[PDB]
Symmetry: C6
Amino acid sequence: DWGTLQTILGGVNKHSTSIGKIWLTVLFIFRIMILVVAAKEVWGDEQADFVCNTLQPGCKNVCYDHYFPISHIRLWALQLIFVSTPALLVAMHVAYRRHEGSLWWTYTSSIFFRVIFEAAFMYVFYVMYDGFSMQRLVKCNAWPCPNTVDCFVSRPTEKTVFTVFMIAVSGICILLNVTELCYLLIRY
Amino acid sequence: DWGTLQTILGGVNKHSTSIGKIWLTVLFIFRIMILVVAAKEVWGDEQADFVCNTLQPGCKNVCYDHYFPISHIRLWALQLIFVSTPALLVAMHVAYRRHEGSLWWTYTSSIFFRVIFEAAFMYVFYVMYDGFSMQRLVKCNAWPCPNTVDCFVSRPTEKTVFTVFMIAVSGICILLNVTELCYLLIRY
Amino acid sequence: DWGTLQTILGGVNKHSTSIGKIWLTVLFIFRIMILVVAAKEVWGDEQADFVCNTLQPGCKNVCYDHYFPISHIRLWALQLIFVSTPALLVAMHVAYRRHEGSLWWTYTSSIFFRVIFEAAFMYVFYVMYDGFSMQRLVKCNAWPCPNTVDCFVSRPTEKTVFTVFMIAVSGICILLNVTELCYLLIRY
Amino acid sequence: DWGTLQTILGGVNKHSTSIGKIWLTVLFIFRIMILVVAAKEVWGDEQADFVCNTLQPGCKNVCYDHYFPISHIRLWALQLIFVSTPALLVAMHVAYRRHEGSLWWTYTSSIFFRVIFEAAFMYVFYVMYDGFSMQRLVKCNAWPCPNTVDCFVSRPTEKTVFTVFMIAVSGICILLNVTELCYLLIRY
Amino acid sequence: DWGTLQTILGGVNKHSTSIGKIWLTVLFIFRIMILVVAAKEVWGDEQADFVCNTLQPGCKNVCYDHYFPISHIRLWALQLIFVSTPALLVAMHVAYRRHEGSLWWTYTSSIFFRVIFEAAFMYVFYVMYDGFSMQRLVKCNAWPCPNTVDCFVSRPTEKTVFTVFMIAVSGICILLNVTELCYLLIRY
Amino acid sequence: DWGTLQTILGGVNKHSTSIGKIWLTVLFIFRIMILVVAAKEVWGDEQADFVCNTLQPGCKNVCYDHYFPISHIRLWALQLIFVSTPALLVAMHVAYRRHEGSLWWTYTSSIFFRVIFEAAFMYVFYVMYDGFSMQRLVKCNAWPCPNTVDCFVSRPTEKTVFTVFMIAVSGICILLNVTELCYLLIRY
């Protein structure tokens, strides 16, 4: 929903650098549009259409929870909020400044927190789901499922396409932030 | 939804102290974003996907009600409203003041109510759910369920992750308020 | 939804008295937040999860209608609209005045209608549901149910918590209005 | 949704008469609030929870259509739009006037169309549903239902309460318009 | 949703003629209100409640598709967008003009496209659905349905009422545009 | 939702050329209206109403995923975002310019990226779905479906109508951009 975000993005459109003015902000808007407009309804029936070949009551609940401890959309929602906080803090700091070394140290710290935040979430996506490709079939042997029970995921291919798309864009944002640090580092 | 909250948070952005200007407000916004964007849809199917291994009609309703007297999202919604009231009252009080001891006593009372409100809700979350970890299996023996009936919870792991996240952030907000009282106390 | 309610509450924030400026308005906002944010989704599955132990077609419809002639959320929605009308009328009356006895009589009449409106709805909640506690089991013998049929309510405990919360806040608003009348009565 | 209706109602708040300024506008807002906030979700499951005691395929569709040619909420939605048109036309006519007999004839014609529009819809509600009370049981013998089939309505009591409430308020609006005509008629 | 449409309709409220200022714009708003507020939820369960008397898998999908190649609400949505384009183009053309023969030719062409657009869609509604009345029973013999299968439509009467209402209003808009051409033609 | 898009489209309404001012912007708005108002609810039950003639658990999930790797609405959502980025970048570039060769090279590059972006997505729609016509019947032999299983698509005809409509409009936008390049090329 639009609401009044134009004031926020327009307000933070200033107080930036050569690449922070445009390139780092359009990509952040780019990820929000993908998550809200298209990606949010792909995971709508993640559990409703999760089908297991068994008659054991409660086996469906435990198997979905075992292989999906947290949904992909929830992780992406958390990642965007975390990376948007250092930018927000420095955005209102220059307003107080207009109301240099400490400001320079404040700015160079925000770009350092964004790199590790994106790297951490990108690392979580790999260890938790053993890769960026979602499989059609998952084998589940958790209690109370008898022996091993075959379960099938809903829309595995479409979720894979968005998973690769989100990771690739986040990797690009890391490169821009790294070049931003190098740009300021040489200037001293 | 954005609507016009920017005027509220922007309006209450002033009339604050060294840490109340930024740190105590971003965390309050942080909890709202988590509850609305991500956490609210995790508890969407709390009762729909609640499965019990029985054929007794009405046993599902009583067991879910017994182990979930009030949903976690409802408690968090109540907590945010209560803690936001003392800040709102003092926010409009300084507007009347611009329209010192009594103002100082008014301000130091708001930070005292927020500490006990957050402590009370944090205490309720512990006694009601015997900890911050949600179990996959719950054993239910309430009428009319015959003997003991096994029931299974929906998304126990994902709800645990958000439960720990909300508690940890609320604990941080307590520390900031405590330091705020100590900051004013030494000044006298 | 925010929309433009800030203009309404901000507009009616003026034209008030010592307690009408803040205390009587925050509680009115307090009840709206509880009803919309949390309480509205508790009654979402009031009839969907209503379970009766019978095979008679149509017995479920008649029993739910017999014990729930009108939902609690609908009654609270009606109550808020009725109590907000006398305040709205006097809010736009002073605008015409700025555009004393008659104004004083107009103001003292609004606080009189709000007391009886809240008392009436509070009385309806008692006679209709024989108390503020909702039971897990209801015994139904209306046609076409054969003999007496046991039916089970959805989320009886959680609805009880909000029922007590709404009644208690409404009782507090009665006391404030009563003191408002006494405050003006002594002044003459 | 609020959106920008405050400009519309605030704009049409002027250009009125002694009772058109307040009394005739608050009641019109009153009906909108009832229809949107509370009444619209009562008829949500009108057909989903419509249950017939038969095994004949397609008998449910024909019986619901026979006894409910048009839903109550749809009729109320049509009625509000029709009655709001004469007021809207004269609202923008005085703006052209500021940009007397013809204006007086224009104004007195709007109150004449509103009386017959409300009377017509009130008459339709009576002949179509043979009264303002909804029954729990309806007997249906339309093809392809064999012989007579018993069907049960969803929430008959709650729909009756709102049906009486809407009719009573509409009857009050007729009286105000009638007095408005008499008020101008004596003045000549 | 309101949003900012008041600026659009208010902006295009000017730059019109004797009947284009009011009559042709209120009817266009009239159709939008009917389609959004009331008519859009009537077709909500068009396929969910479509019932066929057969046990053949996939027969329900083919029969609904055969008799409903495109929903009525989708056709009305397309019609409103098409007819609103010539008005929009001339609305921004006069803004460039303020920034006569060509303008006169531009204006008289917009009213010519609106007549044929409404006539075309009105013709499509007739040939596709063989009239403006929807039947309760449809006989389907498409593959893989064996022989002829009886299927039943959801809410046939209510959809008929709105179908006649939309056609009648669109016919009125044709007459206004025709008189607009005749009004300018005699003037030369 | 309107929100504040009028400022965006109104803001980018300037800074354009003879055809970029109106023709290229109304078509872009045209596609958004079709996708949001009408086309988005056609694909609502794409998987819910997907029916296969088999008793093998999990065969429905794999067959829908095999023939629909990504939904048509998701592809259109991606296409609109990509084509809207070059226009957005040059829209804010002229604001910096007002705050010629490089500007001319910047403008002529945006129209070059839009041609290849639309051509690429149009090519994807052809190879992935072997044409712009959707079939009622799909034959599926992927594991674990035994032998070949017949499955039926929901609303194949209505989706075909919108598929042709979206492709045709996108083809028109390519022609306008091509003429835009030729218009500037001759001028040099």
